[PDB]
Amino acid sequence: FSAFSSSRWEYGSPRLERYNGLPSMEILGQAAPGKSTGEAMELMEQLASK
Amino acid sequence: NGKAKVSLITSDGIKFPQDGTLEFSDVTVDQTTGSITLRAIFPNPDHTMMPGM
């Protein structure tokens, strides 16, 4: 194989996460100790509509 | 001097450093693949050509 196959390196994303035929990137996250998801999810909705 | 230049992209991707001359053109068309088999004569300073690759 070294007689002909000229190797190299490239990028590549292994987790090619899709969505109904659309590529996507899932993001996780918790909420604060002592606080709730609704003051964190709507906080994300302050930061996802950006 | 229509005996034109020929250069390489040899097996390591980097070009062979100096060019070389298309000596002639055959008229010896292979029946199978369409060969107008040319002939590029090259200088070979450090024997970095190894006839056969």
Curated annotation (Swiss-Prot), chain A:
Knockout or disruption consequences: Loss of susceptibility to contact-dependent growth inhibition (CDI); inhibiting cells still contact the target.
Subcellular location: Cell inner membrane
Induction profile: Positively regulated by MarA, Rob and SoxS transcriptional regulators (at protein level).
Coiled-coil intervals, chain numbering: none
Family: Belongs to the resistance-nodulation-cell division (RND) (TC 2.A.6) family.
Function in brief: AcrA-AcrB-AcrZ-TolC is a drug efflux protein complex with broad substrate specificity that uses the proton motive force to export substrates. (Microbial infection) Involved in contact-dependent growth inhibition (CDI), acts downstream of BamA, the receptor for CDI. Its role in CDI is independent of the AcrA-AcrB-TolC efflux pump complex.
Subunit description: Homotrimer, with large domains that extend into the periplasm, interacts with AcrA and TolC. AcrA may be required to stably link this protein and TolC. Interacts with AcrZ. Part of the AcrA-AcrB-AcrZ-TolC efflux pump.
Protein name: Multidrug efflux pump subunit AcrB
Organism expressing this protein natively: Escherichia coli (strain K12)
Parent sequence residues shown: 801 to 850 of 1049
From Swiss-Prot, chain B:
Deletion consequences: Cannot grow on efflux substrates novobiocin or fusidic acid.
Localization (cell): Cell inner membrane
Function field: AcrA-AcrB-AcrZ-TolC is a drug efflux protein complex with broad substrate specificity that uses the proton motive force to export substrates. This subunit may act as an adapter protein that links AcrB and TolC stably together. It is elongated in shape, being long enough to span the periplasm.
Family: Belongs to the membrane fusion protein (MFP) (TC 8.A.1) family.
Subunit details: Monomeric in solution. Homotrimeric; interacts independently with AcrB and TolC as well as AcrZ. Part of the AcrA-AcrB-TolC efflux pump. Complex assembly is independent of an efflux substrate and appears to be constitutive.
Protein name per its UniProtKB record: Multidrug efflux pump subunit AcrA
Source organism per UniProt: Escherichia coli (strain K12)
Positions spanned in the full protein: 239 to 291 of 397
